[PDB]
Protein backbone atom coordinates (compact mmCIF):
# COMPACT_ATOMS: atom_id res chain seq x y z
CA UNK A 1 0.00 0.00 0.00
CA UNK A 2 1.10 3.58 -0.63
CA UNK A 3 3.31 4.96 2.18
CA UNK A 4 1.27 7.94 3.36
CA UNK A 5 1.72 6.85 6.97
CA UNK A 6 5.41 7.78 6.86
CA UNK A 7 4.73 11.22 5.33
CA UNK A 8 1.79 12.44 7.42
CA UNK A 9 2.74 10.73 10.70
CA UNK A 10 6.50 11.36 10.51
CA UNK A 11 8.06 12.30 13.84
CA UNK A 12 9.87 15.40 12.55
CA UNK A 13 8.89 17.58 9.60
CA UNK A 14 11.22 19.66 7.46
CA UNK A 15 11.78 23.39 7.72
CA UNK A 16 9.86 25.14 4.97
CA UNK A 17 12.97 26.54 3.30
CA UNK A 18 14.38 22.99 3.09
CA UNK A 19 11.03 21.40 2.32
CA UNK A 20 11.03 17.60 1.88
CA UNK A 21 9.77 15.88 -1.26
CA UNK A 22 8.65 12.24 -1.26
CA UNK A 23 7.88 10.54 -4.58
CA UNK A 24 4.87 8.19 -4.47
CA UNK A 25 4.67 5.60 -7.24
CA UNK A 26 3.83 1.96 -7.96
CA UNK A 27 1.43 1.54 -5.05
CA UNK A 28 -2.30 1.72 -4.33
CA UNK A 29 -3.67 4.59 -2.26
CA UNK A 30 -7.10 5.25 -0.75
CA UNK A 31 -7.21 9.02 -1.14
CA UNK A 32 -10.76 9.12 0.19
CA UNK A 33 -9.67 8.08 3.69
CA UNK A 34 -7.43 11.15 3.94
CA UNK A 35 -10.29 13.46 2.93
CA UNK A 36 -12.65 11.75 5.38
CA UNK A 37 -10.29 12.31 8.32
CA UNK A 38 -11.30 15.05 10.77
CA UNK A 39 -7.69 15.75 11.78
CA UNK A 40 -7.04 18.24 8.95
CA UNK A 41 -7.98 21.90 9.26
CA UNK A 42 -7.11 22.53 5.59
CA UNK A 43 -7.94 20.23 2.68
CA UNK A 44 -8.05 22.31 -0.51
CA UNK A 45 -7.78 20.78 -3.98
CA UNK A 46 -6.97 22.64 -7.18
CA UNK A 47 -7.73 21.26 -10.63
CA UNK A 48 -9.16 18.07 -9.10
CA UNK A 49 -12.06 17.01 -6.89
CA UNK A 50 -11.29 15.45 -3.50
CA UNK A 51 -14.18 12.99 -3.72
CA UNK A 52 -13.29 11.77 -7.23
CA UNK A 53 -9.60 11.47 -6.32
CA UNK A 54 -9.59 7.68 -5.98
CA UNK A 55 -11.05 7.10 -9.44
CA UNK A 56 -8.23 9.01 -11.14
CA UNK A 57 -4.95 7.75 -12.62
CA UNK A 58 -1.68 9.67 -12.19
CA UNK A 59 1.63 9.69 -14.02
CA UNK A 60 3.59 10.81 -10.96
CA UNK A 61 2.70 11.78 -7.40
CA UNK A 62 4.81 14.05 -5.18
CA UNK A 63 4.24 14.64 -1.46
CA UNK A 64 6.03 17.78 -0.20
CA UNK A 65 6.00 18.46 3.52
CA UNK A 66 7.16 21.19 5.91
CA UNK A 67 6.06 23.28 8.90
CA UNK A 68 4.89 26.92 8.86
CA UNK A 69 2.82 29.29 10.98
CA UNK A 70 -0.97 29.10 10.95
CA UNK A 71 -1.26 32.59 9.48
CA UNK A 72 0.94 31.48 6.54
CA UNK A 73 -1.07 28.42 5.46
CA UNK A 74 -3.12 30.61 3.10
CA UNK A 75 0.10 31.20 1.13
CA UNK A 76 0.33 27.51 0.18
CA UNK A 77 -2.04 27.97 -2.76
CA UNK A 78 -1.63 28.94 -6.42
CA UNK A 79 -1.38 32.64 -7.12
CA UNK A 80 -0.41 33.68 -3.59
CA UNK A 81 2.39 35.97 -2.39
CA UNK A 82 4.18 36.45 0.91
CA UNK A 83 7.48 35.58 2.56
CA UNK A 84 6.65 31.85 2.34
CA UNK A 85 5.29 31.76 -1.21
CA UNK A 86 7.91 34.23 -2.44
CA UNK A 87 11.04 32.96 -0.72
CA UNK A 88 10.40 29.47 0.65
CA UNK A 89 7.83 27.30 -1.16
CA UNK A 90 6.04 28.36 -4.34
CA UNK A 91 3.12 26.66 -6.04
CA UNK A 92 2.53 27.24 -9.77
CA UNK A 93 -0.52 29.03 -11.10
CA UNK A 94 -1.53 25.83 -12.94
CA UNK A 95 -1.19 23.63 -9.87
CA UNK A 96 -3.14 20.38 -9.89
CA UNK A 97 -3.17 18.74 -6.48
CA UNK A 98 -4.24 19.19 -2.88
CA UNK A 99 -2.92 21.17 0.10
CA UNK A 100 -3.41 19.46 3.46
CA UNK A 101 -2.59 21.10 6.79
CA UNK A 102 -3.22 20.56 10.49
CA UNK A 103 -2.28 22.25 13.75
CA UNK A 104 0.82 20.68 15.31
CA UNK A 105 1.13 22.77 18.48
CA UNK A 106 1.25 19.62 20.63
CA UNK A 107 4.13 18.25 18.53
CA UNK A 108 6.19 21.19 17.30
CA UNK A 109 5.91 23.78 20.11
CA UNK A 110 8.08 23.62 23.23
CA UNK A 111 8.07 25.56 26.48
CA UNK A 112 10.86 28.08 26.13
CA UNK A 113 10.52 27.94 22.35
CA UNK A 114 11.29 25.36 19.67
CA UNK A 115 13.87 26.92 17.33
CA UNK A 116 14.47 23.94 15.04
CA UNK A 117 12.02 25.20 12.37
CA UNK A 118 13.27 27.95 10.06
CA UNK A 119 12.10 30.06 7.14
CA UNK A 120 14.00 32.23 4.67
CA UNK A 121 13.45 35.95 5.36
CA UNK A 122 15.83 37.50 2.81
CA UNK A 123 16.08 36.69 -0.90
CA UNK A 124 16.77 39.08 -3.78
CA UNK A 125 14.23 37.39 -6.08
CA UNK A 126 11.12 35.26 -5.83
CA UNK A 127 11.34 31.48 -6.07
CA UNK A 128 10.25 29.73 -9.21
CA UNK A 129 7.55 27.09 -8.64
CA UNK A 130 8.81 24.02 -6.77
CA UNK A 131 12.20 25.68 -6.30
CA UNK A 132 14.14 24.85 -3.13
CA UNK A 133 16.86 27.22 -1.89
CA UNK A 134 19.02 25.96 0.96
CA UNK A 135 21.91 28.42 0.77
CA UNK A 136 22.96 30.24 3.94
CA UNK A 137 24.99 33.01 2.31
CA UNK A 138 24.96 36.31 4.19
CA UNK A 139 22.39 38.60 2.55
CA UNK A 140 23.80 41.89 1.22
CA UNK A 141 21.12 44.55 1.77
CA UNK A 142 23.43 47.40 0.73
CA UNK A 143 26.31 48.12 -1.63
CA UNK A 144 29.15 47.03 0.66
CA UNK A 145 30.05 43.32 0.42
CA UNK A 146 29.47 41.24 3.54
CA UNK A 147 32.40 38.80 3.13
CA UNK A 148 30.73 36.21 5.33
CA UNK A 149 30.36 38.60 8.28
CA UNK A 150 26.98 39.44 9.77
CA UNK A 151 26.51 43.13 10.49
CA UNK A 152 24.75 46.24 9.29
CA UNK A 153 23.06 45.53 5.95
CA UNK A 154 24.58 42.01 6.21
CA UNK A 155 21.99 39.54 7.44
CA UNK A 156 21.78 35.81 7.93
CA UNK A 157 18.96 34.88 5.52
CA UNK A 158 17.11 32.40 7.74
CA UNK A 159 15.05 33.10 10.86
CA UNK A 160 13.54 30.74 13.42
CA UNK A 161 9.84 30.53 14.22
CA UNK A 162 10.53 29.68 17.87
CA UNK A 163 7.14 28.07 18.46
CA UNK A 164 5.82 28.26 22.02
CA UNK A 165 2.66 26.41 23.14
CA UNK A 166 1.13 29.63 24.50
CA UNK A 167 1.22 31.23 21.03
CA UNK A 168 -1.93 32.53 19.47
CA UNK A 169 -3.16 30.16 16.78
CA UNK A 170 -1.82 32.29 13.93
CA UNK A 171 1.63 31.94 15.51
CA UNK A 172 1.26 28.18 16.16
CA UNK A 173 2.95 25.56 13.99
CA UNK A 174 1.01 23.82 11.24
CA UNK A 175 2.16 20.67 9.47
CA UNK A 176 1.56 20.86 5.73
CA UNK A 177 1.55 18.17 3.05
CA UNK A 178 1.26 19.17 -0.62
CA UNK A 179 0.13 16.40 -3.00
CA UNK A 180 0.89 17.34 -6.61
CA UNK A 181 -0.26 15.13 -9.51
CA UNK A 182 1.09 14.95 -13.06
CA UNK A 183 -2.39 14.71 -14.60
Amino acid at each position, epitope marked *: LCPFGEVFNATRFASVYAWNRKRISNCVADYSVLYNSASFSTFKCYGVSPTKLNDLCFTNVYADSFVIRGDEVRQIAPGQT*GKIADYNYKLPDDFTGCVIAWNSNNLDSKVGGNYNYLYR*LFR*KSNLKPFERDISTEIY*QAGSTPCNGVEGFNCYFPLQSYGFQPTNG*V*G*YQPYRVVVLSFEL
Partner: antibody
Amino acid sequence: QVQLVESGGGLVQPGGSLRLSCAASGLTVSSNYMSWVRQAPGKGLEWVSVIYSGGSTYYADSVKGRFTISRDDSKNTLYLQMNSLRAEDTAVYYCARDVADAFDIWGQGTMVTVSS
Amino acid sequence: DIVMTQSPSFLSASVGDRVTITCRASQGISSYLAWYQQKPGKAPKLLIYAASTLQSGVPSRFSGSGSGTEFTLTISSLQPEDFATYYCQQLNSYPPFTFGPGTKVDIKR
Protein backbone atom coordinates in the same frame (compact mmCIF):
# COMPACT_ATOMS: atom_id res chain seq x y z
CA GLN B 1 26.19 58.18 5.79
CA VAL B 2 22.98 56.10 5.85
CA GLN B 3 19.77 58.00 5.33
CA LEU B 4 16.33 58.16 3.73
CA VAL B 5 15.35 61.57 2.32
CA GLU B 6 11.67 62.15 1.61
CA SER B 7 10.06 64.76 -0.61
CA GLY B 8 6.75 65.48 -2.31
CA GLY B 9 4.49 66.41 0.57
CA GLY B 10 2.10 69.31 0.19
CA LEU B 11 -1.50 70.46 -0.09
CA VAL B 12 -4.13 68.39 -1.91
CA GLN B 13 -7.87 68.59 -2.33
CA PRO B 14 -10.07 65.63 -1.37
CA GLY B 15 -10.19 63.26 -4.32
CA GLY B 16 -6.82 64.51 -5.53
CA SER B 17 -3.50 62.77 -6.03
CA LEU B 18 0.04 63.17 -4.78
CA ARG B 19 3.29 61.25 -5.23
CA LEU B 20 5.88 61.00 -2.46
CA SER B 21 9.51 60.01 -3.04
CA CYS B 22 12.15 58.64 -0.68
CA ALA B 23 15.75 58.75 -1.89
CA ALA B 24 17.96 56.28 -0.05
CA SER B 25 21.67 56.46 0.73
CA GLY B 26 23.59 53.68 2.44
CA LEU B 27 21.11 50.89 1.70
CA THR B 28 19.73 49.40 -1.51
CA VAL B 29 15.99 50.03 -1.76
CA SER B 30 15.38 47.14 -4.15
CA SER B 31 16.94 44.52 -1.85
CA ASN B 32 15.11 45.60 1.31
CA TYR B 33 11.68 45.50 2.89
CA MET B 34 10.73 49.19 2.44
CA SER B 35 7.61 50.71 3.99
CA TRP B 36 5.62 53.91 4.34
CA VAL B 37 4.37 54.74 7.84
CA ARG B 38 2.24 57.79 8.65
CA GLN B 39 1.27 59.76 11.74
CA ALA B 40 -1.77 62.04 11.73
CA PRO B 41 -1.60 65.19 13.90
CA GLY B 42 -1.66 64.13 17.54
CA LYS B 43 -2.14 60.42 16.83
CA GLY B 44 -0.08 57.24 16.81
CA LEU B 45 1.83 55.44 14.08
CA GLU B 46 0.01 53.75 11.23
CA TRP B 47 1.80 51.50 8.76
CA VAL B 48 0.60 52.14 5.20
CA SER B 49 2.41 49.97 2.66
CA VAL B 50 5.42 47.73 2.10
CA ILE B 51 7.35 46.48 -0.94
CA TYR B 52 9.52 43.34 -0.80
CA SER B 53 12.85 42.81 -2.54
CA GLY B 54 11.16 40.29 -4.83
CA GLY B 55 8.42 42.75 -5.79
CA SER B 56 5.40 41.73 -3.71
CA THR B 57 3.41 44.68 -2.32
CA TYR B 58 0.93 45.04 0.52
CA TYR B 59 -1.26 47.82 1.89
CA ALA B 60 -3.13 48.68 5.05
CA ASP B 61 -6.87 48.13 4.73
CA SER B 62 -7.38 51.88 5.14
CA VAL B 63 -5.54 52.69 1.88
CA LYS B 64 -5.99 49.59 -0.30
CA GLY B 65 -7.11 50.48 -3.81
CA ARG B 66 -6.11 54.13 -3.44
CA PHE B 67 -2.36 53.97 -2.77
CA THR B 68 0.33 52.21 -4.79
CA ILE B 69 3.93 51.69 -3.62
CA SER B 70 6.77 51.36 -6.11
CA ARG B 71 10.50 51.83 -6.58
CA ASP B 72 13.14 52.91 -9.12
CA ASP B 73 16.26 50.78 -8.69
CA SER B 74 18.35 53.06 -10.91
CA LYS B 75 17.68 56.10 -8.70
CA ASN B 76 17.63 54.02 -5.48
CA THR B 77 14.32 55.71 -4.66
CA LEU B 78 11.03 54.55 -3.15
CA TYR B 79 7.69 56.06 -4.11
CA LEU B 80 4.14 56.22 -2.80
CA GLN B 81 1.46 57.24 -5.30
CA MET B 82 -1.63 58.40 -3.41
CA ASN B 83 -4.94 58.74 -5.26
CA SER B 84 -8.46 59.69 -4.18
CA LEU B 85 -7.06 61.33 -1.08
CA ARG B 86 -9.28 62.15 1.90
CA ALA B 87 -8.98 64.51 4.85
CA GLU B 88 -8.19 61.56 7.16
CA ASP B 89 -5.05 60.94 5.07
CA THR B 90 -3.58 64.19 6.43
CA ALA B 91 -0.42 63.08 8.23
CA VAL B 92 3.35 63.10 8.30
CA TYR B 93 4.56 60.30 6.01
CA TYR B 94 7.75 58.39 6.81
CA CYS B 95 9.62 55.90 4.66
CA ALA B 96 11.44 53.18 6.56
CA ARG B 97 13.47 49.97 6.18
CA ASP B 98 12.60 46.96 8.32
CA VAL B 99 14.72 43.98 9.34
CA ALA B 100 12.48 41.20 10.67
CA ASP B 101 9.70 43.82 10.92
CA ALA B 102 11.75 46.19 13.15
CA PHE B 103 12.18 49.62 11.53
CA ASP B 104 15.81 50.60 12.09
CA ILE B 105 16.14 53.35 9.43
CA TRP B 106 13.58 56.15 9.09
CA GLY B 107 13.25 59.17 6.87
CA GLN B 108 12.70 62.64 8.31
CA GLY B 109 9.04 62.81 7.30
CA THR B 110 7.10 64.83 4.74
CA MET B 111 3.78 66.44 5.62
CA VAL B 112 0.66 65.83 3.55
CA THR B 113 -2.44 67.99 4.01
CA VAL B 114 -5.74 67.03 2.37
CA SER B 115 -8.32 69.80 2.56
CA SER B 116 -10.99 71.50 0.47
CA ASP C 1 -7.04 39.96 15.36
CA ILE C 2 -4.44 40.43 18.10
CA VAL C 3 -4.77 43.68 20.05
CA MET C 4 -1.76 45.53 21.44
CA THR C 5 -2.30 47.70 24.53
CA GLN C 6 0.12 49.84 26.54
CA SER C 7 -0.07 50.80 30.22
CA PRO C 8 0.08 53.49 31.51
CA SER C 9 -0.95 55.95 28.80
CA PHE C 10 0.84 58.73 30.71
CA LEU C 11 3.73 58.56 33.18
CA SER C 12 5.45 61.25 35.23
CA ALA C 13 9.01 60.64 36.37
CA SER C 14 12.17 62.44 37.46
CA VAL C 15 15.75 62.18 36.30
CA GLY C 16 17.36 59.17 37.96
CA ASP C 17 14.10 57.28 38.41
CA ARG C 18 13.51 53.68 37.29
CA VAL C 19 10.77 53.59 34.67
CA THR C 20 8.79 50.55 33.48
CA ILE C 21 6.28 50.68 30.61
CA THR C 22 4.19 47.62 29.83
CA CYS C 23 2.82 46.36 26.50
CA ARG C 24 0.18 43.63 26.33
CA ALA C 25 -0.95 41.23 23.60
CA SER C 26 -4.42 39.68 23.63
CA GLN C 27 -2.86 36.40 22.43
CA GLY C 28 0.58 34.84 22.78
CA ILE C 29 3.17 36.34 20.44
CA SER C 30 6.33 34.69 21.81
CA SER C 31 9.08 37.36 21.63
CA TYR C 32 7.70 39.14 18.54
CA LEU C 33 7.89 42.65 19.98
CA ALA C 34 9.84 45.84 19.29
CA TRP C 35 10.00 49.14 21.21
CA TYR C 36 10.45 52.65 19.82
CA GLN C 37 11.10 56.10 21.29
CA GLN C 38 9.60 59.13 19.56
CA LYS C 39 10.04 62.81 20.31
CA PRO C 40 7.65 65.42 18.91
CA GLY C 41 8.15 66.13 15.23
CA LYS C 42 10.89 63.49 14.93
CA ALA C 43 10.86 60.01 13.44
CA PRO C 44 10.61 57.12 15.90
CA LYS C 45 13.84 55.49 17.06
CA LEU C 46 14.23 51.72 17.37
CA LEU C 47 15.25 50.75 20.91
CA ILE C 48 14.53 47.03 21.29
CA TYR C 49 13.62 44.15 18.99
CA ALA C 50 12.84 40.48 19.61
CA ALA C 51 11.48 41.69 22.98
CA SER C 52 14.90 41.91 24.68
CA THR C 53 17.60 42.63 22.08
CA LEU C 54 19.08 46.11 22.43
CA GLN C 55 19.45 47.95 19.13
CA SER C 56 23.03 48.99 18.43
CA GLY C 57 23.83 52.54 19.49
CA VAL C 58 21.10 52.61 22.15
CA PRO C 59 22.23 53.31 25.74
CA SER C 60 22.43 50.33 28.07
CA ARG C 61 19.91 51.79 30.52
CA PHE C 62 17.19 50.66 28.09
CA SER C 63 16.24 47.01 28.42
CA GLY C 64 13.31 44.88 27.32
CA SER C 65 11.80 41.74 28.81
CA GLY C 66 8.89 39.36 28.51
CA SER C 67 7.58 36.58 26.28
CA GLY C 68 4.03 35.61 25.37
CA THR C 69 1.45 38.25 26.31
CA GLU C 70 3.23 40.58 28.80
CA PHE C 71 6.17 42.77 27.80
CA THR C 72 8.12 45.46 29.65
CA LEU C 73 10.41 48.31 28.65
CA THR C 74 12.60 49.44 31.56
CA ILE C 75 14.77 52.56 31.80
CA SER C 76 17.06 51.92 34.74
CA SER C 77 18.03 55.56 35.44
CA LEU C 78 15.97 58.14 33.56
CA GLN C 79 17.98 60.87 31.84
CA PRO C 80 16.74 64.28 30.62
CA GLU C 81 16.78 63.12 26.99
CA ASP C 82 14.44 60.19 27.76
CA PHE C 83 11.28 62.26 28.21
CA ALA C 84 9.38 61.16 25.11
CA THR C 85 6.60 58.89 23.88
CA TYR C 86 7.30 55.13 23.71
CA TYR C 87 5.58 52.71 21.35
CA CYS C 88 5.60 48.93 21.23
CA GLN C 89 5.09 47.07 17.97
CA GLN C 90 3.94 43.50 17.30
CA LEU C 91 6.36 41.80 14.91
CA ASN C 92 5.22 39.55 12.04
CA SER C 93 1.61 40.36 12.84
CA TYR C 94 -1.49 39.72 10.72
CA PRO C 95 -2.46 42.38 9.64
CA PRO C 96 1.10 43.74 9.34
CA PHE C 97 2.88 46.24 11.54
CA THR C 98 0.43 46.69 14.40
CA PHE C 99 1.61 49.43 16.77
CA GLY C 100 0.65 49.97 20.37
CA PRO C 101 -1.00 53.32 21.21
CA GLY C 102 1.96 54.80 23.09
CA THR C 103 3.02 55.90 26.58
CA LYS C 104 4.04 59.51 27.12
CA VAL C 105 6.67 60.11 29.82
CA ASP C 106 6.77 63.68 31.17
CA ILE C 107 8.69 65.47 33.90
CA LYS C 108 7.35 65.11 37.43
CA ARG C 109 7.05 68.18 39.67
